[PDB]
């Protein structure tokens with residue numbers, strides 16, 4: 001309905017009780033009035049611009065005289081803002097477009113809330129790829145608000161970015177560490193445990209004991225890669241390459257390159273490392 005309702009006998013109470021969550025801007029107007037002529041275009045174009053953020057509710061004062069008298073109407077035009085069932089602000093007369101913003105600006109949700117709401121819907125539709133940029137933006141804007149943090153972390157997990165999700169979960173304030181947080185943490189914990197293999201543990205010990213042995217570290221990097229611990233695998237190999245490009249008789253570089261190939265050109269971690277490798281080699 002372009003978010004504009006003409007009010008009559010049948011929809012006054014139904015929109016008065018729809019103000020319970022959606023802000024309603026009642027617009028008392030007349031086709032007779034020169035104040036309305038340049039308020040109406042300002043008002044409608046904001047209705048369509050905000051798209052369901054508020055309802056512009058027009059009451060034709062010539063057509064609906066009973067309802068207008070019951071509003072206490074004293075001038076045309078009059079606009080009143082209705083929320084939680086109740087009138088909360090308004091004005092009589094015509095006004096600049098930024099005056100009307102000021103009015104709207106108080107009651108309308110913040111950009112990060114709007115983005116978080118859109119992302120929540122996309123998450124519901126299992127569209128995590130599109131939720132992610134909105135959640136990144138909303139999280140930043142909100143100064144890393146914990147509830148948005150939880151959405152972002154869940155979205156990162158679904159996109160197989162558990163390390164990034166874990167970093168976001170580290171930021172969640174203690175008061176927000178409730179059932180949803182616990183569930184995400186438990187998921188990350190089980191993932192880390194599942195990737196913490198006996199074979200990796202004994203290689204990690206052996207590397208600790210002989211940190212210069214590039215062939216050992218390369219073995220370990222391979223087994224880390226195979227359980228998805230790529231940040232660790234690449235960091236470990238690259239450290240060896242920085243010391244010696246021919247490390248483990250060429251094998252360190254070869255394994256490093258083979259891992260980057262296996263991650264594919266769409267992987268952001270692999271892309272970082274490709275660029276670092278080129279600068280190192282040449």
Ligand SMILES: [Ca+2]
Pocket residue numbers: 278279280281282
């Ligand atoms: Ca260089």
